[PDB]
Amino acid sequence: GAMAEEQMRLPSADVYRFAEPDSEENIIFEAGIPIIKAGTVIKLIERLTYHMYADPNFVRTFLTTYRSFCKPQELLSLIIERFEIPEAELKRFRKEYIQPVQLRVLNVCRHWVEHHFYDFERDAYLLQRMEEFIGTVRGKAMKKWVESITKIIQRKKIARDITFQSSPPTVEWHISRPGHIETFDLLTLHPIEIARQLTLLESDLYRAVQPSELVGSVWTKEDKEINSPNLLKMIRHTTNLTLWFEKCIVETENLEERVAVVSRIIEILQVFQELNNFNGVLEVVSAMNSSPVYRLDHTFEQIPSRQKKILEEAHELSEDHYKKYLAKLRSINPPCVPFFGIYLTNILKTEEGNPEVLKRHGKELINFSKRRKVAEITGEIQQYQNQPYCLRVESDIKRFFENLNPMGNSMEKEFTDYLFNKSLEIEPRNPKPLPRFPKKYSYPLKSPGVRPSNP
Numbered sequence: 458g459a460m461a462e463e464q465m466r467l468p469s470a471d472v473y474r475f476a477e478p479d480s481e482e483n484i485i486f487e488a489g490i491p492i493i494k495a496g497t498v499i500k501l502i503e504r505l506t507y508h509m510y511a512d513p514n515f516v517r518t519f520l521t522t523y524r525s526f527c528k529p530q531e532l533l534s535l536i537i538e539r540f541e542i543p544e545a546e547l548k549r550f551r552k553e554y555i556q557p558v559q560l561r562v563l564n565v566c567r568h569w570v571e572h573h574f575y576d577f578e579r580d581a582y583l584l585q586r587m588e589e590f591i592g593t594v595r596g597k598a599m600k601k602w603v604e605s606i607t608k609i610i611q612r613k614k615i616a617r618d619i620t621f622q623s624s625p626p627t628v629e630w631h632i633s634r635p636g637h638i639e640t641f642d643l644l645t646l647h648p649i650e651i652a653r654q655l656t657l658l659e660s661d662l663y664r665a666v667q668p669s670e671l672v673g674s675v676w677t678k679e680d681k682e683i684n685s686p687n688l689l690k691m692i693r694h695t696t697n698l699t700l701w702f703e704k705c706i707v708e709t710e711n712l713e714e715r716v717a718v719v720s721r722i723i724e725i726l727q728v729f730q731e732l733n734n735f736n737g738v739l740e741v742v743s744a745m746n747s748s749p750v751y752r753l754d755h756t757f758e759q760i761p762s763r764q765k766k767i768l769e770e771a772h773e774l775s776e777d778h779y780k781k782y783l784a785k786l787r788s789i790n791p792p793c794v795p796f797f798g799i800y801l802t803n804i805l806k807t808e809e810g811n812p813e814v815l816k817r818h819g820k821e822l823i824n825f826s827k828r829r830k831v832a833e834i835t836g837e838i839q840q841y842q843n844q845p846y847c848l849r850v851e852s853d854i855k856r857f858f859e860n861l862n863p864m865g866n867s868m869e870k871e872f873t874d875y876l877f878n879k880s881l882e883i884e885p886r887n888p889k890p891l892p893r894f895p896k897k898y899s900y901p902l903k904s905p906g907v908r909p910s911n912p
């Protein structure tokens with residue numbers, strides 16, 4: 458009948474793999490555009506280039522997350538296989554099936570090269586594969602798609618190899634003067650300017666992270682450096698700044714000097730708060746909560762009450778699954794640098810909390826809802842990625858913070874053991890006595906404060 462007339466108009470299974478019937482054994486949906494829960498890769502590709510309607514949500518999310526279940530080489534071949542459909546009925550079949558599916562495939566190619574060129578930048582063979590495919594396309598409406606895609610391939614070819622709206626404030630200095638990079642340090646640089654330069658650095662690092670770097674826990678795999686470079690730069694910066702804060706504290710063995718170091722780092726946090734760099738606030742909080750620093754009760758004692766409160770209120774941002782942090786983040790306007798660590802925590806819970814596959818009628822379907830959920834979290838990341846700061850770069854201070862290496866030649870575990878042993882040395886556990894230590898700093902320790910220029 459008329460049901461068979463639709464299917465028999467389409468190609469049979471012996472000549473074409475992307476036209477088998479929709480069923481409980483190959484595809485599952487969660488009225489309008491149906492949201493695909495799970496399915497085999499063949500059925501996911503079919504829906505990615507479906508003839509009845511455009512699915513821009515599915516295209517975006519598929520291309521962001523497909524590497525967790527399908528290689529780029531495998532994907533390119535499957536969309537070419539979808540494209541090469543075997544041929545009044547012929548004229549209607551060309552009208553309603555061949556032309557729209559071929560239009561949808563090229564839209565996927567256009568999206569792929571525009572938004573995920575790094576695949577083609579990684580694999581040289583994948584690019585010349587993609588260009589050869591687009592080269593062999595002859596059609597009426599198909600010509601401007603070929604020009605539009607090859608336009609973008611040229612834009613990314615040249616891309617392979619700052620302006621302010623308002624007047625940015627004066628770069629502030631303290632002990633170290635412009636150019637004297639050998640004297641640059643925590644207490645010698647201006648605290649305001651340390652916060653500004655770290656925020657600019659972290660903002661740039663936040664903005665460079667792409668969605669695919671976070672999918673499938675690929676930053677903790679054998680192939681992490683090419684799959685997740687910007688992500689790894691962000692994580693490593695945080696590691697290096699946090700351990701550097703801890704090192705500055707615990708290697709200051711004189712109590713009164715250590716109090717000054719801690720107080721200065723609290724001031725850096727205060728300026729991060731003014732800038733809405735929440736990444737920076739929680740790096741300071743992490744450093745202050747770490748095993749070596751948190752146990753220094755004698756250092757805590759001499760911190761002014763108002764600074765104590767600032768740290769205590771900053772910690773409380775993290776309590777109850779970051780409730781107050783999330784409310785603070787929604788309440789502010791740009792520019793900001795969101796706390797990056799929460800996205801990794803929630804992505805890991807989603808990855809670990811949902812299975813790779815779903816069984817239905819004794820066959821393993823790919824869990825696409827798992828990928829979309831991860832992609833929804835990366836969507837939140839992206840909405841804070843176009844927020845430039847009205848702040849002037851200082852190249853020497855930037856370079857200093859970009860090249861932090863507190864661990865030196867040590868391993869992380871080894872260095873954090875050293876930090877804790879150093880903590881025990883400077884403030885021994887009770888009932889052992891507290892020894893006095895000599896001063897290490899020859900310059901004045903009084904801070905210049907966090908109020909900028911223009912009295």
Ligand SMILES: COC1=C(OC)Cc2c(nc(C)nc2N[C@H](C)c2ccc(-c3ccccc3CO)s2)C1
Binds near residue numbers: 742745752756757770
């Ligand atoms: C549940 O356990 C809690 C924590 O675990 C580590 C931390 C924490 C908790 N409640 C609050 C309000 N604030 C906390 N941390 C903030 C950031 C800090 C206040 C002061 C700090 C400090 C700094 C330098 C030297 C010494 C100390 C402290 O002896 S660190 C509760």
